[PDB]
Ligand SMILES: Oc1ccc2c(c1)CC[C@H](c1ccccc1)[C@@H]2c1ccc(OCCN2CCCC2)cc1
């Protein structure tokens with residue numbers, strides 16, 4: 001896992017990409033309903049993607065669940081922002097569900113606006129697909145790593161492993177930038193620009209989690225046990 | 236500001252550092268908690284405004300954008316300051332030199348949750364052996380980055396403002412790399428450490444959101460600094 005080359009890391013991540021799902025509605029002849037149904041179906045595929053992120057299945061089941069519990073909304077969001085990049089002023093939730101900010105005003109527009117701004121920022125930077133899949137894996141590995149409130153020997157080893165995998169993704173990002181002919185200065189500047197966007201994505205997830213919690217619906221935040229069930233796969 | 240050398244940037248940030256304040260209580264009296272922390276935070280905010288104006292490039296911005304940046308970043312900046320001065324006190328948070336608290340003392344006034352996250356950040360700083368020069372760079376990055384994706388304006392002036400902010404952020408990136416090269420780190424180690432440092436900022440954003448949630452939940456008129464209060468201090 002930690003022996004992969006930069007190109008091999010990229011190929012692994014590109015091959016692991018989840019599919020783009022459609023919204024489920026009768027196109028012949030409810031907004032939050034549609035988004036929730038979409039998000040729920042994406043989550044199943046996200047679990048498959050996560051297990052194919054180099055290093056992720058080396059972790060205990062418990063730590064895998066903790067990471068996904070922390071990162072799942074950030075991952076949905078960065079995927080949406082990536083899909084939306086070439087659609088200025090709109091969010092491509094699905095190919096049959098492309099919404100502008102006005103259509104967010106039915107429940108939400110605050111969140112829509114933050115996502116739209118991220119998409120624009122990605123457009124301004126000319127974010128590449130290879131960079132995107134690196135950033136998405138970084139979110140998965142990083143978002144929950146500081147909240148392992150455990151200091152068992154096992155936990156120390158798990159955190160050390162995660163930071164080693166995060167280092168390899170850093171090396172990989174730098175490599176893609178060197179491959180594109182960027183100077184050393186441009187490389188570290190772009191690395192920093194990309195990573196700083198992750199704090200905003202964290203911010204957006206927190207705002208969105210605040211909404212889901214306020215709905216006071218039993219199933220709207222994925223339980224540890226539900227995440228456990230999807231992750232704890234038999235063979 | 237964009238013409239400062241790396242060493243000049245560091246010197247300017249080091250000289251701009253705010254003082255360490257004390258908690259205001261009669262130490263001869265029996266040992267409220269939120270009251271002490273709030274009084275401390277309020278007095279720190281005044282010095283924070285002073286610090287911000289000495290961050291190279293910050294006063295080049297419009298008053299309105301300065302307020303926006305501080306509105307977005309002020310709790311993150313208090314938190315990173317806390318985590319930094321707690322670095323050499325494992326298991327404790329050094330709110331002030333006369334107010335060193337462990338997690339059991341956080342349980343008095345949903346605070347232990349926030350205490351635990353702060354403690355974990357301090358431990359992460361400790362393990363990375365974070366340096367003072369690095370810390371002031373990171374704090375400046377928070378000030379400039381946290382609000383830059385939420386200006387929600389695309390006037391010519393706002394385009395110029397965002398461009399300037401990203402140029403200053405780039406210079407701070409250059410500065411961090413130079414500090415690491417000065418310390419003898421290889422190019423690989425430099426990029427990996429830059430990444431490790433910046434990824435911690437997502438967790439600090441997370442912590443600020445959790446804390447803002449508490450302050451808002453108090454329903455007290457002045458506990459979240461208003462736009463116009465920040466404007467008066469920034470005049
Ligand atoms: O590609 C995507 C599909 C749907 C979404 C997003 C990306 C980005 C955030 C969205 C959002 C809008 C308003 C409030 C909060 C978030 C929305 C979305 C809606 C609902 C969600 O949660 C539904 C609950 N559901 C239960 C288990 C997991 C999710 C997640 C995301």
Ligand SMILES: Oc1ccc2c(c1)CC[C@H](c1ccccc1)[C@@H]2c1ccc(OCCN2CCCC2)cc1
Pocket residue numbers: 272273275276277279280310313314316317330346349446447449450457458459460
């Ligand atoms: O060095 C510092 C002084 C005080 C603090 C911190 C750092 C870190 C977060 C703290 C916290 C504890 C519980 C909940 C939220 C945050 C607490 C703190 C307490 C109160 C605060 O807000 C008071 C309101 N006040 C009104 C204008 C500005 C702040 C901010 C930070």
